[PDB]
């Protein structure tokens, strides 16, 4: 599990469950091609998106559908979604944990990278 | 205005208005003595808390009554209040802006020193 | 000034100066078309990006070149850039302030609509 | 483990290791009495601070010595420490995860509360 996404709800103080996440990889033609997708679990985590064999060097985009999440709770959010764009494995394989802390009009995203 | 406090509401995307703020300075006996207080304005800001003459080197505590703010909106918050404790260095012309971004179960505080 | 962008540096506790910002509007063909751009000032702010006449309802993308900012300071950042995508509602007098608090491996973005 | 503290470093993108944490409980005389303390592990987490039997209703203060952490890295931080004050178990026993994301001049703290 070289890529893990964790989403938390800062309004309710709980994991953000059933949040849709789409991952893309920048293609040679500067186009974003679908790479993997899924929904966060009851723990607010999404595991098994890819394997170290498939997760090669490149630029990736993790899109978190925050809008749908807030609408389901009856809250009109500001952002359409949260995006995290980064270069991965440029100096060798690494393990990435992408966390997003969500509020209707604000979100923070942090990355923890290990070997 | 060497010290300014700004409070924002991350739930509504607006300044946090009428938020009580208390500032304390640590006394020689390690006790927190009242220094200044006020409530944020319609812009979520609190100016005029002190003067450069009064704002001497020391350890200060800025307490933001976040609990009362959320209760007024009908939301049960997690924290009793938000606290920012820092040392005023006083090494060259310096203005301190303390900002707090509030959510019911989370808050971030940032300091911009210029 | 219906749209304003503010960028702060959480590592140095100061405004993030000379940060390139590009704004895009989603076109009818779902394509991102250039809308406005500029660089933050000494106060970390970027004003005058557009006018209320030009700023019509739609989906906008604000791209902040955070990578170049950190590289100039000798720090290898995680993100390529920071993106804020939102819908301008245009339902009553509304000013949008988009703020981004930057750290090498983390950033937060908040919107204050007044 | 009704109380867990997690500390992350937003500058290096890693867990904040060996961070001193002191927990206090407000006494009947409005005084902060020592409750528990420890240091974060290699994962940036601190477990085993207390038990559900000892963790009774009350107001608690979790103090994170962020200043020492940054000084060890050669960075002059703004805050003396990070404090999190909250009422716990007022409506029954709950599990609390207190997370702190650290930067030299900024920090965010979030709480995830479960049953
Ligand atoms: O001015 C706004 O509209 C504004 C909006 C959202 C967040 C911040 C703002 O000013 C600051 C400062 C600051 O001014 O020092 C510091 C941290 C966060 C913010």
Short mmCIF file of C-alpha atoms and ligand atoms in Angstrom, two decimals:
data_model
loop_
_atom_site.label_atom_id
_atom_site.label_comp_id
_atom_site.label_asym_id
_atom_site.label_seq_id
_atom_site.Cartn_x
_atom_site.Cartn_y
_atom_site.Cartn_z
CA UNK A 1 0.00 0.00 0.00
CA UNK A 2 2.26 2.81 -1.34
CA UNK A 3 -0.62 5.29 -1.47
CA UNK A 4 -3.18 5.85 1.27
CA UNK A 5 -5.74 8.62 1.64
CA UNK A 6 -7.31 9.66 4.92
CA UNK A 7 -10.19 12.11 5.19
CA UNK A 8 -11.48 13.68 8.39
CA UNK A 9 -14.49 15.85 9.23
CA UNK A 10 -13.56 18.92 11.33
CA UNK A 11 -17.22 19.83 11.88
CA UNK A 12 -18.31 16.57 13.47
CA UNK A 13 -14.95 15.38 14.78
CA UNK A 14 -15.08 12.09 12.93
CA UNK A 15 -13.66 10.26 9.92
CA UNK A 16 -15.24 11.38 6.64
CA UNK A 17 -16.95 8.19 5.45
CA UNK A 18 -17.92 7.24 1.89
CA UNK A 19 -15.96 10.10 0.34
CA UNK A 20 -15.24 9.50 -3.34
CA UNK A 21 -11.57 9.73 -4.29
CA UNK A 22 -10.20 9.73 -7.84
CA UNK A 23 -6.51 9.45 -8.60
CA UNK A 24 -4.99 10.47 -11.91
CA UNK A 25 -1.53 10.25 -13.43
CA UNK A 26 -0.22 12.83 -15.87
CA UNK A 27 0.29 11.20 -19.27
CA UNK A 28 3.11 11.93 -21.73
CA UNK A 29 0.75 14.32 -23.53
CA UNK A 30 0.19 16.39 -20.38
CA UNK A 31 -3.26 14.84 -20.00
CA UNK A 32 -4.68 13.49 -16.73
CA UNK A 33 -5.39 9.80 -17.17
CA UNK A 34 -7.50 7.82 -14.66
CA UNK A 35 -5.26 5.82 -12.33
CA UNK A 36 -7.41 4.54 -9.47
CA UNK A 37 -10.47 5.45 -7.45
CA UNK A 38 -12.47 4.40 -4.42
CA UNK A 39 -14.41 5.61 -1.41
CA UNK A 40 -13.18 6.09 2.14
CA UNK A 41 -14.15 3.44 4.68
CA UNK A 42 -15.76 3.84 8.10
CA UNK A 43 -12.33 4.83 9.41
CA UNK A 44 -12.08 7.61 6.83
CA UNK A 45 -9.29 5.72 5.07
CA UNK A 46 -8.85 4.41 1.55
CA UNK A 47 -6.33 1.59 1.11
CA UNK A 48 -5.44 -0.66 -1.80
CA UNK A 49 -5.56 2.02 -4.48
CA UNK A 50 -2.43 0.71 -6.17
CA UNK A 51 0.67 -1.50 -5.89
CA UNK A 52 4.33 -0.55 -5.78
CA UNK A 53 4.73 -2.17 -9.20
CA UNK A 54 2.06 0.04 -10.78
CA UNK A 55 2.89 3.19 -8.81
CA UNK A 56 5.78 4.41 -10.99
CA UNK A 57 7.47 7.81 -10.98
CA UNK A 58 5.29 10.59 -12.28
CA UNK A 59 2.93 13.40 -11.39
CA UNK A 60 -0.27 12.34 -9.69
CA UNK A 61 -3.48 14.11 -8.84
CA UNK A 62 -5.67 12.98 -5.98
CA UNK A 63 -9.14 14.48 -6.27
CA UNK A 64 -11.42 14.28 -3.23
CA UNK A 65 -15.12 14.90 -3.88
CA UNK A 66 -15.73 17.08 -0.84
CA UNK A 67 -18.77 18.80 -2.34
CA UNK A 68 -20.90 15.64 -2.42
CA UNK A 69 -19.85 14.85 1.15
CA UNK A 70 -21.06 18.17 2.55
CA UNK A 71 -24.26 18.21 0.48
CA UNK A 72 -25.24 14.84 1.96
CA UNK A 73 -25.00 16.46 5.39
CA UNK A 74 -27.14 19.40 4.31
CA UNK A 75 -24.28 21.90 4.23
CA UNK A 76 -23.51 24.11 1.23
CA UNK A 77 -19.70 23.96 0.85
CA UNK A 78 -17.38 26.41 -0.88
CA UNK A 79 -15.08 24.10 -2.87
CA UNK A 80 -16.09 21.87 -5.79
CA UNK A 81 -13.53 19.37 -4.56
CA UNK A 82 -10.10 19.15 -2.96
CA UNK A 83 -7.11 18.43 -5.19
CA UNK A 84 -3.63 17.28 -4.23
CA UNK A 85 -1.01 17.29 -6.98
CA UNK A 86 2.47 15.91 -6.44
CA UNK A 87 5.44 14.21 -8.05
CA UNK A 88 5.88 10.69 -6.73
CA UNK A 89 8.80 8.27 -6.50
CA UNK A 90 11.24 10.56 -8.31
CA UNK A 91 14.12 9.33 -6.12
CA UNK A 92 12.87 5.80 -5.59
CA UNK A 93 9.73 4.12 -4.21
CA UNK A 94 8.15 5.82 -1.22
CA UNK A 95 4.99 5.27 0.85
CA UNK A 96 2.57 8.20 0.76
CA UNK A 97 -0.20 9.05 3.18
CA UNK A 98 -2.36 11.93 1.97
CA UNK A 99 -4.64 13.36 4.64
CA UNK A 100 -7.36 15.93 4.20
CA UNK A 101 -9.07 17.76 7.07
CA UNK A 102 -12.43 19.11 5.89
CA UNK A 103 -14.59 22.08 6.84
CA UNK A 104 -17.30 23.63 4.64
CA UNK A 105 -15.21 26.68 3.70
CA UNK A 106 -11.74 25.38 4.43
CA UNK A 107 -9.59 22.29 4.14
CA UNK A 108 -6.02 21.40 4.81
CA UNK A 109 -4.10 18.61 3.23
CA UNK A 110 -0.93 17.11 4.58
CA UNK A 111 1.38 14.44 3.29
CA UNK A 112 3.47 12.04 5.34
CA UNK A 113 6.12 10.32 3.26
CA UNK A 114 8.15 7.32 4.40
CA UNK A 115 10.41 4.61 2.95
CA UNK B 1 -0.81 48.38 17.05
CA UNK B 2 1.96 45.84 17.82
CA UNK B 3 -0.59 43.08 18.42
CA UNK B 4 -3.67 42.19 16.38
CA UNK B 5 -6.00 39.19 16.59
CA UNK B 6 -8.10 37.85 13.73
CA UNK B 7 -10.70 35.08 14.02
CA UNK B 8 -12.40 33.33 11.12
CA UNK B 9 -15.26 30.85 10.87
CA UNK B 10 -14.41 27.87 8.62
CA UNK B 11 -17.98 26.54 8.76
CA UNK B 12 -19.71 29.63 7.41
CA UNK B 13 -16.79 31.18 5.52
CA UNK B 14 -16.97 34.45 7.40
CA UNK B 15 -15.22 36.51 10.04
CA UNK B 16 -15.94 35.26 13.56
CA UNK B 17 -17.75 38.26 15.07
CA UNK B 18 -18.12 39.18 18.74
CA UNK B 19 -15.62 36.57 19.89
CA UNK B 20 -14.23 37.31 23.34
CA UNK B 21 -10.45 37.46 23.52
CA UNK B 22 -8.39 37.72 26.69
CA UNK B 23 -4.66 38.40 26.71
CA UNK B 24 -2.42 37.59 29.66
CA UNK B 25 1.22 38.21 30.46
CA UNK B 26 3.25 35.82 32.61
CA UNK B 27 4.26 37.52 35.86
CA UNK B 28 7.57 37.14 37.69
CA UNK B 29 5.88 34.55 39.92
CA UNK B 30 4.94 32.38 36.92
CA UNK B 31 1.33 33.55 37.24
CA UNK B 32 -0.86 34.70 34.34
CA UNK B 33 -1.87 38.31 34.91
CA UNK B 34 -4.63 40.00 32.88
CA UNK B 35 -3.12 42.21 30.18
CA UNK B 36 -5.89 43.19 27.76
CA UNK B 37 -9.20 41.94 26.37
CA UNK B 38 -11.91 42.70 23.87
CA UNK B 39 -14.26 41.23 21.29
CA UNK B 40 -13.67 40.82 17.58
CA UNK B 41 -15.38 43.31 15.27
CA UNK B 42 -17.57 42.68 12.24
CA UNK B 43 -14.38 42.02 10.29
CA UNK B 44 -13.37 39.37 12.82
CA UNK B 45 -10.48 41.54 13.95
CA UNK B 46 -9.47 42.97 17.30
CA UNK B 47 -7.24 46.05 17.23
CA UNK B 48 -5.99 48.43 19.91
CA UNK B 49 -5.33 45.78 22.55
CA UNK B 50 -2.08 47.44 23.58
CA UNK B 51 0.65 49.95 22.72
CA UNK B 52 4.31 49.40 21.87
CA UNK B 53 5.19 51.13 25.14
CA UNK B 54 3.17 48.64 27.21
CA UNK B 55 3.93 45.57 25.07
CA UNK B 56 7.31 44.68 26.61
CA UNK B 57 9.30 41.47 26.20
CA UNK B 58 7.70 38.55 27.95
CA UNK B 59 5.53 35.49 27.56
CA UNK B 60 1.96 36.18 26.55
CA UNK B 61 -1.16 34.08 26.37
CA UNK B 62 -4.00 34.89 24.01
CA UNK B 63 -7.19 33.08 24.97
CA UNK B 64 -10.02 32.94 22.46
CA UNK B 65 -13.43 31.96 23.83
CA UNK B 66 -14.38 29.65 20.96
CA UNK B 67 -16.87 27.65 23.01
CA UNK B 68 -19.28 30.57 23.50
CA UNK B 69 -19.02 31.39 19.79
CA UNK B 70 -20.14 27.92 18.67
CA UNK B 71 -22.83 27.62 21.34
CA UNK B 72 -24.42 30.83 20.05
CA UNK B 73 -24.68 29.17 16.64
CA UNK B 74 -26.24 26.04 18.09
CA UNK B 75 -23.17 23.87 17.60
CA UNK B 76 -21.57 21.80 20.37
CA UNK B 77 -17.81 22.37 20.03
CA UNK B 78 -14.96 20.22 21.26
CA UNK B 79 -12.59 22.78 22.78
CA UNK B 80 -13.23 24.92 25.86
CA UNK B 81 -11.28 27.69 24.18
CA UNK B 82 -8.27 28.24 21.94
CA UNK B 83 -4.97 29.33 23.48
CA UNK B 84 -1.90 30.82 21.86
CA UNK B 85 1.19 31.15 24.04
CA UNK B 86 4.27 32.88 22.70
CA UNK B 87 7.29 34.97 23.59
CA UNK B 88 7.45 38.56 22.38
CA UNK B 89 11.09 39.01 21.34
CA UNK B 90 11.18 42.76 20.72
CA UNK B 91 14.25 42.67 18.48
CA UNK B 92 13.51 45.26 15.81
CA UNK B 93 10.23 46.83 14.62
CA UNK B 94 7.73 43.96 14.88
CA UNK B 95 3.96 43.73 14.56
CA UNK B 96 2.25 40.49 15.63
CA UNK B 97 -0.89 39.23 13.93
CA UNK B 98 -2.42 36.17 15.56
CA UNK B 99 -5.03 34.45 13.41
CA UNK B 100 -7.32 31.61 14.41
CA UNK B 101 -9.37 29.57 11.92
CA UNK B 102 -12.24 27.92 13.75
CA UNK B 103 -14.18 24.69 13.20
CA UNK B 104 -16.24 22.86 15.86
CA UNK B 105 -13.68 20.09 16.35
CA UNK B 106 -10.59 21.76 14.98
CA UNK B 107 -8.78 25.06 14.85
CA UNK B 108 -5.55 26.32 13.47
CA UNK B 109 -3.66 29.33 14.66
CA UNK B 110 -1.01 31.13 12.72
CA UNK B 111 1.23 34.05 13.53
CA UNK B 112 2.41 36.55 10.97
CA UNK B 113 5.21 38.76 12.30
CA UNK B 114 6.14 41.73 10.13
CA UNK C 1 -12.45 43.86 -5.99
CA UNK C 2 -14.82 40.84 -5.88
CA UNK C 3 -11.88 38.42 -5.66
CA UNK C 4 -8.76 38.66 -3.51
CA UNK C 5 -6.02 36.10 -2.84
CA UNK C 6 -3.81 36.02 0.25
CA UNK C 7 -0.84 33.70 0.77
CA UNK C 8 1.02 33.19 4.03
CA UNK C 9 4.20 31.34 4.97
CA UNK C 10 3.74 29.12 8.04
CA UNK C 11 7.46 28.32 8.24
CA UNK C 12 8.70 31.90 8.53
CA UNK C 13 5.55 33.52 9.91
CA UNK C 14 5.31 36.04 7.12
CA UNK C 15 3.34 36.91 4.01
CA UNK C 16 4.31 34.76 1.03
CA UNK C 17 5.71 37.37 -1.37
CA UNK C 18 6.02 37.15 -5.16
CA UNK C 19 3.95 33.99 -5.39
CA UNK C 20 2.55 33.42 -8.86
CA UNK C 21 -1.21 32.97 -8.99
CA UNK C 22 -3.22 31.94 -12.05
CA UNK C 23 -7.00 32.04 -12.19
CA UNK C 24 -9.03 30.05 -14.69
CA UNK C 25 -12.71 29.87 -15.56
CA UNK C 26 -14.33 26.67 -16.82
CA UNK C 27 -15.49 27.12 -20.41
CA UNK C 28 -18.67 25.72 -21.97
CA UNK C 29 -16.58 22.84 -23.32
CA UNK C 30 -15.41 21.87 -19.83
CA UNK C 31 -11.99 23.38 -20.57
CA UNK C 32 -10.06 25.67 -18.21
CA UNK C 33 -9.56 29.03 -19.89
CA UNK C 34 -7.12 31.64 -18.55
CA UNK C 35 -8.99 34.34 -16.63
CA UNK C 36 -6.44 36.40 -14.69
CA UNK C 37 -3.02 36.12 -13.06
CA UNK C 38 -0.51 38.00 -10.98
CA UNK C 39 1.98 37.75 -8.13
CA UNK C 40 1.36 38.42 -4.45
CA UNK C 41 2.64 41.71 -3.07
CA UNK C 42 4.84 42.38 -0.04
CA UNK C 43 1.73 41.90 2.09
CA UNK C 44 1.16 38.48 0.53
CA UNK C 45 -1.98 39.76 -1.16
CA UNK C 46 -3.11 39.93 -4.76
CA UNK C 47 -5.76 42.53 -5.59
CA UNK C 48 -7.27 43.76 -8.85
CA UNK C 49 -7.48 40.36 -10.53
CA UNK C 50 -10.91 41.15 -11.94
CA UNK C 51 -14.00 43.38 -11.84
CA UNK C 52 -17.55 42.60 -10.78
CA UNK C 53 -18.59 43.09 -14.40
CA UNK C 54 -16.20 40.40 -15.64
CA UNK C 55 -16.56 38.07 -12.64
CA UNK C 56 -19.74 36.28 -13.76
CA UNK C 57 -21.27 33.10 -12.34
CA UNK C 58 -19.23 30.03 -13.13
CA UNK C 59 -16.65 27.59 -11.87
CA UNK C 60 -13.24 29.06 -11.20
CA UNK C 61 -9.85 27.59 -10.46
CA UNK C 62 -7.21 29.48 -8.52
CA UNK C 63 -3.78 27.94 -8.95
CA UNK C 64 -1.01 28.98 -6.58
CA UNK C 65 2.53 28.13 -7.66
CA UNK C 66 3.73 26.98 -4.24
CA UNK C 67 6.53 24.81 -5.63
CA UNK C 68 8.51 27.76 -7.05
CA UNK C 69 8.05 29.63 -3.77
CA UNK C 70 9.62 26.88 -1.66
CA UNK C 71 12.39 26.16 -4.16
CA UNK C 72 13.48 29.80 -3.96
CA UNK C 73 13.90 29.32 -0.22
CA UNK C 74 15.92 26.15 -0.66
CA UNK C 75 13.18 23.82 0.54
CA UNK C 76 11.96 20.80 -1.42
CA UNK C 77 8.15 20.91 -1.19
CA UNK C 78 5.66 18.09 -1.63
CA UNK C 79 2.99 19.70 -3.81
CA UNK C 80 3.38 20.85 -7.41
CA UNK C 81 1.02 23.70 -6.63
CA UNK C 82 -2.09 24.48 -4.60
CA UNK C 83 -5.47 24.55 -6.33
CA UNK C 84 -8.76 26.02 -5.17
CA UNK C 85 -11.82 25.21 -7.28
CA UNK C 86 -15.14 26.81 -6.47
CA UNK C 87 -18.40 28.07 -7.89
CA UNK C 88 -19.11 31.80 -7.84
CA UNK C 89 -22.80 32.03 -6.91
CA UNK C 90 -23.43 35.73 -7.48
CA UNK C 91 -26.51 35.90 -5.25
CA UNK C 92 -26.21 39.26 -3.53
CA UNK C 93 -23.21 41.58 -2.95
CA UNK C 94 -20.32 39.16 -2.37
CA UNK C 95 -16.56 39.57 -2.08
CA UNK C 96 -14.39 36.45 -2.14
CA UNK C 97 -11.14 36.23 -0.20
CA UNK C 98 -9.15 33.06 -0.85
CA UNK C 99 -6.37 32.48 1.67
CA UNK C 100 -3.68 29.83 1.55
CA UNK C 101 -1.42 28.98 4.50
CA UNK C 102 1.70 27.27 3.20
CA UNK C 103 4.06 24.68 4.67
CA UNK C 104 6.43 22.43 2.66
CA UNK C 105 4.30 19.31 3.11
CA UNK C 106 0.98 20.86 3.96
CA UNK C 107 -1.29 23.74 3.11
CA UNK C 108 -4.70 24.90 4.11
CA UNK C 109 -6.97 27.08 2.09
CA UNK C 110 -9.89 29.00 3.44
CA UNK C 111 -12.51 31.17 1.82
CA UNK C 112 -14.09 34.15 3.51
CA UNK C 113 -17.14 35.42 1.63
CA UNK C 114 -18.54 38.75 2.80
CA UNK D 1 -6.74 3.51 25.17
CA UNK D 2 -9.41 6.24 25.62
CA UNK D 3 -6.92 9.02 24.91
CA UNK D 4 -4.40 9.07 22.08
CA UNK D 5 -2.25 11.93 20.81
CA UNK D 6 -0.77 12.11 17.35
CA UNK D 7 1.73 14.75 16.26
CA UNK D 8 2.86 15.42 12.70
CA UNK D 9 5.54 17.63 11.17
CA UNK D 10 4.24 19.74 8.25
CA UNK D 11 7.74 20.95 7.36
CA UNK D 12 9.32 17.54 6.83
CA UNK D 13 6.19 15.54 6.03
CA UNK D 14 6.75 13.03 8.80
CA UNK D 15 5.54 12.04 12.26
CA UNK D 16 6.86 14.33 14.99
CA UNK D 17 8.98 11.94 17.08
CA UNK D 18 10.01 12.28 20.73
CA UNK D 19 7.62 15.17 21.36
CA UNK D 20 6.91 15.64 25.06
CA UNK D 21 3.23 15.63 25.98
CA UNK D 22 1.78 16.53 29.38
CA UNK D 23 -1.85 15.97 30.28
CA UNK D 24 -3.57 17.74 33.15
CA UNK D 25 -7.00 17.50 34.74
CA UNK D 26 -8.72 20.50 36.30
CA UNK D 27 -9.07 19.94 40.04
CA UNK D 28 -12.01 20.98 42.22
CA UNK D 29 -10.06 24.12 43.14
CA UNK D 30 -9.73 25.18 39.49
CA UNK D 31 -6.08 24.10 39.53
CA UNK D 32 -4.42 22.03 36.81
CA UNK D 33 -3.19 18.79 38.35
CA UNK D 34 -0.77 16.45 36.53
CA UNK D 35 -2.65 13.53 34.98
CA UNK D 36 -0.28 11.76 32.60
CA UNK D 37 2.67 12.42 30.33
CA UNK D 38 4.87 10.79 27.73
CA UNK D 39 6.68 11.27 24.45
CA UNK D 40 5.48 10.45 20.95
CA UNK D 41 6.88 7.32 19.33
CA UNK D 42 8.49 6.86 15.92
CA UNK D 43 4.98 6.91 14.45
CA UNK D 44 4.28 10.28 16.05
CA UNK D 45 1.75 8.65 18.37
CA UNK D 46 1.43 8.44 22.13
CA UNK D 47 -0.68 5.57 23.47
CA UNK D 48 -1.31 4.21 26.96
CA UNK D 49 -1.63 7.59 28.68
CA UNK D 50 -4.58 6.42 30.76
CA UNK D 51 -7.32 3.81 31.24
CA UNK D 52 -11.08 4.16 30.93
CA UNK D 53 -11.33 3.63 34.69
CA UNK D 54 -9.03 6.57 35.45
CA UNK D 55 -10.26 8.81 32.62
CA UNK D 56 -13.34 10.22 34.38
CA UNK D 57 -15.50 13.18 33.36
CA UNK D 58 -13.77 16.50 33.70
CA UNK D 59 -11.81 19.21 31.93
CA UNK D 60 -8.45 18.14 30.56
CA UNK D 61 -5.51 20.00 29.14
CA UNK D 62 -3.11 18.36 26.72
CA UNK D 63 0.09 20.36 26.46
CA UNK D 64 2.45 19.56 23.58
CA UNK D 65 6.00 20.87 23.92
CA UNK D 66 6.37 22.07 20.33
CA UNK D 67 9.10 24.59 21.17
CA UNK D 68 11.66 21.94 22.17
CA UNK D 69 10.80 19.94 19.04
CA UNK D 70 11.57 22.82 16.66
CA UNK D 71 14.67 23.95 18.54
CA UNK D 72 16.16 20.46 18.15
CA UNK D 73 15.77 20.89 14.39
CA UNK D 74 17.44 24.29 14.47
CA UNK D 75 14.26 26.26 13.84
CA UNK D 76 13.11 29.16 16.03
CA UNK D 77 9.35 28.59 16.52
CA UNK D 78 6.67 31.10 17.46
CA UNK D 79 4.68 29.21 20.12
CA UNK D 80 5.93 28.15 23.56
CA UNK D 81 3.78 25.06 23.22
CA UNK D 82 0.46 23.87 21.85
CA UNK D 83 -2.45 23.46 24.26
CA UNK D 84 -5.71 21.58 23.78
CA UNK D 85 -8.36 22.06 26.45
CA UNK D 86 -11.60 20.11 26.44
CA UNK D 87 -14.34 18.58 28.56
CA UNK D 88 -14.24 14.80 28.40
CA UNK D 89 -16.77 12.03 29.00
CA UNK D 90 -19.56 14.39 30.07
CA UNK D 91 -22.19 12.16 28.43
CA UNK D 92 -20.43 8.85 28.98
CA UNK D 93 -17.05 7.29 28.12
CA UNK D 94 -15.66 8.19 24.71
CA UNK D 95 -12.41 7.49 22.85
CA UNK D 96 -10.43 10.62 21.98
CA UNK D 97 -7.76 11.07 19.34
CA UNK D 98 -6.06 14.45 19.56
CA UNK D 99 -3.95 15.30 16.52
CA UNK D 100 -1.63 18.25 16.09
CA UNK D 101 -0.14 19.32 12.76
CA UNK D 102 2.96 21.43 13.39
CA UNK D 103 4.70 24.24 11.51
CA UNK D 104 7.11 26.76 13.07
CA UNK D 105 4.58 29.62 13.07
CA UNK D 106 1.35 27.68 12.86
CA UNK D 107 -0.33 24.56 14.13
CA UNK D 108 -3.72 23.01 13.85
CA UNK D 109 -5.26 20.59 16.26
CA UNK D 110 -8.15 18.32 15.51
CA UNK D 111 -10.09 15.88 17.62
CA UNK D 112 -11.77 12.69 16.45
CA UNK D 113 -14.20 11.33 19.02
CA UNK D 114 -15.75 7.87 18.91
CA UNK D 115 -17.63 5.45 21.18
O1 LIG E 1 -7.60 38.95 5.29
C1 LIG E 1 -8.34 37.98 5.02
O2 LIG E 1 -9.38 38.17 4.33
C2 LIG E 1 -7.97 36.59 5.51
C3 LIG E 1 -8.84 35.49 5.17
C4 LIG E 1 -8.57 34.17 5.59
C5 LIG E 1 -7.44 33.85 6.36
C6 LIG E 1 -6.53 34.91 6.73
C7 LIG E 1 -6.77 36.29 6.32
O3 LIG E 1 -5.73 37.10 6.82
C8 LIG E 1 -4.87 36.25 7.52
C9 LIG E 1 -3.61 36.50 8.26
C10 LIG E 1 -2.97 37.88 8.41
O4 LIG E 1 -3.51 38.88 7.88
O5 LIG E 1 -1.90 38.03 9.05
C11 LIG E 1 -2.97 35.37 8.88
C12 LIG E 1 -3.50 34.06 8.80
C13 LIG E 1 -4.69 33.80 8.10
C14 LIG E 1 -5.38 34.89 7.46
#
